Design goal:
Name: 30S ribosomal protein S1
Structural class: alpha+beta
Number of strands: 7
Keywords: beta barrel, ribosomal protein
Shape: globular
Entry title: Structural basis for targeting the ribosomal protein S1 of Mycobacterium tuberculosis by pyrazinamide
Strand order of the largest sheet: 1-2-3-5-4
Largest sheet: 5 strands, mixed, barrel
Assembly: monomeric
PDB class: ribosomal protein
Helix content: 25-40%
Number of helices: 3
Length: 159
């Protein structure tokens, strides 16, 4: 969405890990890359060197205005309100095996990379607790979205 708010870009940085792969929409082509809108108020440049493995002379060879793409967040500059994205790197990091950390579940893994069981799920008995039905639904909606994004990425690799 066209206007930009420090507060929204900040909220994006804090809820998105570097390395996360996100759905975007190609909005504009220029000679040195493609602009890709990831979210309301969050548009990044995919540099022309970050579009594909093969050598590219113009971005039109790889994408067009209106294409949907799964792109990797490679850096966020809050001060200059710029996000850097890469299509090529998202595709390098792709794996048939689903890694939820890449697709929106990064904060289900602690700093050593161990899975953190969600609030309301009991690890020992491996069940959801009575009374945590709403947290269960919010977690399942999250996993579901993360899994849909990886399925979109599999579709992208299949092209």
């Amino acid at each position: 969405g066209e206007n930009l708010y420090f507060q929204h870009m900040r909220h994006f940085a804090r809820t998105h890990a570097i390395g996360q792969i996100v759905p975007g929409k190609v909005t504009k082509l220029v000679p040195f890359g493609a602009f890709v809108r990831v979210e309301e108020g969050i548009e990044g440049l995919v540099h022309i060197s970050e579009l594909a493995e093969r050598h590219v002379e113009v971005p039109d060879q790889v994408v067009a205005v209106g294409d949907d793409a799964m792109v990797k967040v490679i850096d966020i500059d809050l001060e200059r309100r710029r996000i850097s994205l890469s299509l090529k790197q998202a595709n390098e990091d792709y794996t048939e095996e689903f890694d939820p950390a890449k697709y929106g579940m990064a904060d289900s893994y602690d700093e050593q990379g161990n899975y953190i069981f969600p609030e309301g799920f009991d690890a020992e008995t491996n069940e959801w607790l009575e009374g945590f039905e709403k947290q269960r639904a919010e977690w399942e909606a999250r996993y579901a979205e993360a899994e849909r994004r990886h399925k979109m990425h599999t579709a992208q690799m299949e092209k």
